[model samples]
Target: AFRYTRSQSFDIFDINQKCFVLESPTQLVALHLQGPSSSQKVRLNIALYRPRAGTGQMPVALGIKGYKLYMSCVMSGTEPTLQLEEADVMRDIDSVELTRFIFYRLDSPAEGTTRFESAAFPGWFICTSLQPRQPVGITNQPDQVNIATYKLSG
Candidate 1:
């Protein structure tokens, strides 16, 4: 289980050692993981909300540092459309439309790593690419690639 508070920031890295980065301040992308000397990388302040009442799924909201925009997934037909939504996690979640900003954290077999499945799209997961600098998207066949496994560090 994750033990991070909203005040602390976490750097998310994929199996290939790429860190999640923001593109155009609106899109979620991945870039090569930088060392301690690099100060340009983006670290996310993740907020873990209460679990979904009946399913026990851990709901989480990830926001950008200055923009206050959270990662969201909207359904387009059968696929998921990744986007950023302006939402505050500090308040009582009463709007059903805001569900797009929540993603369920799922356990992974790989130690020190976890998978985030889109709450709006049950089978799709927050996934990266085998290549660096690719836009972060959701995938249903996580087993086909190693991009689904992500390690977090602060």
Candidate 2:
């Protein structure tokens, strides 16, 4: 288990953009990827930061194409619970691209999960996992930064 802060700013227009926000505390727990052709998999951990009182949501954009993947998030507790936020299935991806839009909104503070699949490559994908702690406030920044650690495995 690790700790970090998340800080990012957005205008009113950006708030109108498609993004997810939590009313309570939320954490992006982990990410996992696997490929059908291979036995190995990739993983990542992440955290999320937000204001104690705010109406707008946070904006996070990750670029992943061709390979399938999954993401998970968790809250602060003894036995943390996890939730699945996004899942991708790529069956016809011939060449991997750089832009894969996999985003979702989390209204409550909890753990999250994501899964992906490469259309062209049956067994190729990625996953991210996250565990969040109590948020600390910084005086100078509008965005909160969450801390995360990750590793890759087969």
The C-alpha TM-scores of every prediction are 0.79, 0.18
lDDT (Cα atoms) of all candidates against the true structure = 0.70, 0.24
Tens-digit lDDT track of model 1 for 78-113: 667777767665544445566667677765545877
Where does candidate 2 stray beyond 4 Å?
1-38, 43-58, 61-67, 74-80, 83-147, 150-154
RMSD of each: 4.2, 18.3
Whose TM-score is greatest here? Answer: 1
What is the C-alpha lDDT profile of model 2 across 1-154, one tens digit per residue?
A: 1112342222110111211222133322221222352322212222232222222233122221122223332232642223333444322222223112222222333422222322212222322212222221111112223222111111
Residue range with the least summed lDDT across 10 consecutive positions in model 2: 10-19
